């Protein structure tokens, strides 16, 4: 199944990266930032403007040409939301080992079309859309993330909201526990990555001793993560995990319509989420201001420091 690409998440310091939509404003700026950080960017792709040299690196008309000219093993996407679905289809067709798309505003139907053929293939893993990116601290950052607060350590952070992902990154760096892998799966309901993949990549990795799990109200991915951690992270030899639930105190909602809202869902996104989190042995924080202190307290309680 497509799940066989789970191990593609953990990029190392030898991961060659291309950037589709190179000439785009955000594309150019964050390509500059990634090159400054040390990301092994090896070129970009722009339709109708490729075949040239920009930023000192080649640009091609298609991901086919970039793959056959450089053999890059991952791609990032900054094309406009109208054309993002076609770019992701082209990236998946080119057999890119890891494709991450950052764009926000993708129509749901086009993302359905993308996700279906993604699930009918086993050799490509997608991160996004509406995601911050994926980073291996000190080795390689991909997407949109402030690498100037990242240090290699023993914390694995996966979260939906990219901005709160950054907040957790900073609050783990402040206490000095470092970071092992930080992934934003993205809040969009139709995304290429979910909680289960990141959690089990973190569990079977020796470099990570503590997992950070920030989720928001709405949906049921947190319940699936809680069930997974109950199944595979219980009893002895279970690395501690700390979770936050953004929106614990919030207005009830809008309650526009029935069906897809509550009928076929797990009616989650409320005070019952945190209960599923304690029931799975996950330590929860009551405020987004003490995640780093909470994980430090969990390490010192079990005496890993």
């Amino acid at each position: 199944s497509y799940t066989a690409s789970r191990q593609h998440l953990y990029v190392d310091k030898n991961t060659k990266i291309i950037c589709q939509g190179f000439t785009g404003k955000q594309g150019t700026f964050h390509s500059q930032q990634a090159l400054e950080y040390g990301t092994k960017l090896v070129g970009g792709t722009t339709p109708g403007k490729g075949g040239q040299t920009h930023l000192g690196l080649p640009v091609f008309n298609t991901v086919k040409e970039a793959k056959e000219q450089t053999g890059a093993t991952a791609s990032v996407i900054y094309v406009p939301p109208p054309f993002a679905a076609a770019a992701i289809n082209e990236a998946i067709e080119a057999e890119i080992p890891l494709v991450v798309c950052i764009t926000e505003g993708i129509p749901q139907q086009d993302m359905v079309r993308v996700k279906h053929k993604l699930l009918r293939q086993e050799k490509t893993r997608l991160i996004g859309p509406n995601c911050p990116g994926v980073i291996n601290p000190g080795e390689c950052k991909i997407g949109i993330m402030p690498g100037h607060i990242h240090k290699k350590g023993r914390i694995g952070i996966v979260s939906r909201s990219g901005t709160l992902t950054y907040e957790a990154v900073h609050q783990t760096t402040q206490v000095g526990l470092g970071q092992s892998l930080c992934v934003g799966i993205g809040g969009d309901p139709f995304n290429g990555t979910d909680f289960i993949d990141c959690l089990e990549i973190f569990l079977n990795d020796s470099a990570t001793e503590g997992i950070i799990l920030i989720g928001e109200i709405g949906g049921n991915a947190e319940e699936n993560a809680a069930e997974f951690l109950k199944q595979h992270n219980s009893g002895p030899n279970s690395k501690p995990v700390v979770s936050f639930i953004a929106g614990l105190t919030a207005p009830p909602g809008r309650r526009m319509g029935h069906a897809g809202a509550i009928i076929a869902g797990g009616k989650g996104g409320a005070k019952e989420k945190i209960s599923a989190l304690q029931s799975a042995g996950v330590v929860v924080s009551m405020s987004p201001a003490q995640l780093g202190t909470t994980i430090y307290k969990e390490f010192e309680k079990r005496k890993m420091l």
């Binding site: 109208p82 505003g105 993708i106 359905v112 909201s161 907040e167 526009m256 405020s287």
Partner: protein, 420 residues
């Protein structure tokens, strides 16, 4: 619960969705729109001058329990002569509907829907909805229409039939017959149900919809199943390629601040507090709300500037928070990332200089440009109260809100500056 914070999905008035179903060929009761009692009279006499139903076109959770300023119960009425139709319409059009969702800031009923009244024999609920569990569209059907569906779904999960659909191969008529026969359709009108579901799915795929709820799909007293309600929740992201649907958006149903925010691609969330904010990303917005509520405060109306917004966007943002008078202390809590922090520093400089923002701006700026932002803040030389810890920022802003509301009581003026 639900989403609320992230995006306000476009909900059309009933008559627009009814027209959309009409043009798609879906079997539907005859319906028209009335803006004044005169054409209400004309349509009532056109439909037979008897057995007519009048519906209010107000976007709210409560429509049959609401109250008008004129003193009428509910948004639906059953009239039997065009004269009483005019009489009741005169108490709807131009009137303000009070429902529990609005509380006191009720929306105004601009138009009404005039329809023929048909007697249903059986009441089915039906819904084509995009969903992540089945990785695509899902046809949900049940024989408990006309009644709230969550209760029967929770108490009797078996009665709610759910069938997924493969998008690349489309929908197959055999699937529609299967759904109709599993709901319990009469064996003589199953073909009509299948045709209606096929047309509804074609409409669902065409207009970039997200959830088409027909509740209740009812068989008439003479066959030829007719849809009664046609709730449609669309996709916010589909604005670029669905121009016809999104142009017909009704803007009277939201505050003018909401309209102004949408004019510049800024998410806006009003509340009942007195601490304004300006947050990058919904997640940190809920984080800021939770941390403020921890310290005894309550956010007033906070925004979301998205990613890559220009300086004019944040200038309009600050104009928008300062427009409300219930705000006392404003915190800009933007962490870096896609949204280049230096443009926000420039925006705060310009907006405080221009609009004379005398309220304590408890800034907290980080990410991908900290040197430029802090350097610009220091160069501008204002009361831009810098902070760099989330908990400390929340503590400071809550205390500043209390100080401001206390000094207003004392009838004295204060000025806030960083400790030397």
């Amino acid at each position: 619960e639900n989403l609320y914070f992230q995006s306000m999905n476009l909900s059309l008035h009933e008559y627009m969705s009814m027209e959309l179903l009409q043009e798609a060929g879906v079997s539907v009761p005859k319906g028209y729109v009335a803006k004044s009692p005169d054409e209400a009279y004309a349509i009532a006499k056109k439909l037979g001058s008897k057995d007519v139903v009048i519906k209010a076109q107000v976007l709210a959770g409560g429509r049959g329990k609401g109250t008008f300023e004129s003193g009428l119960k509910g948004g639906v009425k059953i009239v039997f002569s065009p004269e009483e139709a005019k009489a009741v319409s005169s108490q709807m059009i131009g009137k303000k509907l009070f429902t529990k969702q609005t509380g006191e800031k009720g929306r105004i009923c601009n138009q009404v829907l005039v329809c023929e009244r048909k007697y249903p024999r059986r009441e089915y609920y039906f819904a084509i909805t995009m969903e992540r569990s089945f990785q695509g569209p899902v046809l949900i059907g049940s024989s408990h229409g006309g009644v709230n569906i969550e209760d029967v779904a929770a108490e009797s999960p078996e009665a709610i039939i759910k069938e997924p659909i493969d998008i690349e191969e489309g929908i197959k008529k055999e699937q529609a017959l299967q759904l109709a026969q599993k709901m319990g359709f009469p064996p003589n009108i199953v073909e009509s149900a299948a045709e209606n579901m096929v047309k509804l799915y074609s409409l669902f795929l065409k207009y970039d919809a997200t959830m088409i709820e027909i509740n209740p799909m009812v068989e008439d007293s003479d066959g030829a199943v007719l849809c009664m309600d046609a709730k449609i929740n669309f996709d916010s992201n589909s604005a670029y390629r669905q121009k016809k649907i999104f142009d017909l958006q009704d803007w009277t149903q939201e505050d003018e601040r909401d309209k102004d925010a949408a004019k510049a691609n800024l998410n806006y969330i009003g509340l009942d507090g007195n601490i304004g904010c300006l947050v990058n990303g919904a997640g940190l917005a809920m984080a800021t709300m939770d941390i403020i509520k921890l310290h005894g405060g309550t956010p007033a109306n906070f925004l979301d500037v998205g990613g890559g917004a220009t300086v004019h966007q944040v200038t309009e943002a600050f104009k928008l928070i300062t427009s409300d008078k219930k705000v006392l202390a404003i915190l800009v809590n933007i962490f870096g990332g896609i949204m280049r922090c230096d443009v926000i520093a420039q925006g705060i400089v310009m907006a405080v200089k221009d609009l004379e923002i005398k309220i304590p701006v408890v800034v907290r700026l980080q990410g991908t440009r900290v040197d430029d932002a802090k350097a610009l803040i220091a160069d501008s030389g204002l009361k831009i109260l810098a902070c760099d810890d989330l908990d400390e920022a929340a503590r400071m802003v809550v205390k500043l809100s209390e100080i401001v509301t206390l000094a207003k009581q004392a009838h004295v003026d204060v000025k806030f500056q960083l400790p030397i």
